[PDB]
């Protein structure tokens, strides 16, 4: 409610005071009352990369005709005044034994865009399994063969085109894979301008009505920042009010803990203000 102008006055003023950060610290991380059962079953415990980052039952991604569990959540951000919904699947970095289910989600829904917001390793520890092959190798995951047909590094991210072939049926599917490598776990992007350019590039690569698969290591911190920013960009361009706290709450009603740290929330709120101001015309 209110207007874009008033919401940005409210955000700038509350950044200054700073009531914006206090209200973020007050927000629940996990919505009370939402069941989390499947994620804790004995056969599924080691399918979670982190013990405390689990999908709600209501928004858990199911594999079509397949009972295998995956730690993945549907996250949809509605902009109702624009009759717009931005769909995501937010998931963790696959483990060695969950690559099969990851690629099954991609196949089931013919997802043509994967956004990976992590390096494979940090400080000697593995943060994500390499679920694609180094070109020109071909990888087998759960009855999909994967090959990387193109790989180009920019400054901040790597752009890969991947071919997914179904071993059972012979069909093929192509996926664009963006790996943002300049953004450490529980941190902010190394460069804010690279981040914003990357978010707007992701927006431009959206296919109509198709979820973007977004993941990091846990799939909540850096993913939450990106989702918040894309939502805010859509709201700014449509002259609609932006309440970052409402956005984070809406995400957290669908996948717990989205936007991990106060620094990450402060970063995205400042970025939102920046975008609004440098786009503002008298």
């Amino acid at each position: 409610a209110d207007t874009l102008e008033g919401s940005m006055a409210q955000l700038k003023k509350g950044l200054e005071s700073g009531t914006v950060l206090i209200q973020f610290e007050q927000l629940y991380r996990k919505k009370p009352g939402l069941a989390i059962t499947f994620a804790k079953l004995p056969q599924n415990l080691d399918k979670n990369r982190y013990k405390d980052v689990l999908p709600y039952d209501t928004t858990r991604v199911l594999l079509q005709g397949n009972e295998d569990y995956i730690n993945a959540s549907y996250v949809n951000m509605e902009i109702p005044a624009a009759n717009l919904v931005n769909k995501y699947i937010a998931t963790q970095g696959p483990l060695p034994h969950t690559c099969a289910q990851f690629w099954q989600v991609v196949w089931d829904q013919k997802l043509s865009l994967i956004v990976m917001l992590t390096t494979l390793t940090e400080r000697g520890r593995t943060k994500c399994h390499q679920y694609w092959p180094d070109p020109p190798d071909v990888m087998n995951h759960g009855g999909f063969h994967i090959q990387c047909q193109s790989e180009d590094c920019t400054i901040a991210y790597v752009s890969r085109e991947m071919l997914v072939t179904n071993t059972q049926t012979g069909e093929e599917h192509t996926v664009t894979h963006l790996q943002y490598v300049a953004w450490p776990e529980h941190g902010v992007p190394d460069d804010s301008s690279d981040f914003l350019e990357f978010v707007n590039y992701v927006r431009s690569l959206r296919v109509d009505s198709e979820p973007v698969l977004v993941h990091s290591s846990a799939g909540i911190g850096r993913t939450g920042v990106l989702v918040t920013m894309e939502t805010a960009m859509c709201l700014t361009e449509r002259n609609l009010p932006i309440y970052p706290l409402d956005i984070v709450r809406k995400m957290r009603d669908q996948r717990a803990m989205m936007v991990q740290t106060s620094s990450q929330y402060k970063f995205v709120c400042e970025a939102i203000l920046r975008v609004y101001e440098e786009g503002l015309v008298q």
Binding site: Y50, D52, E185, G221
Partner: peptide, 7 residues
């Protein structure tokens, strides 16, 4: 099984 680290 360990928690997602925080800073």
């Amino acid at each position: 099984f360990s928690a997602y680290p925080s800073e």
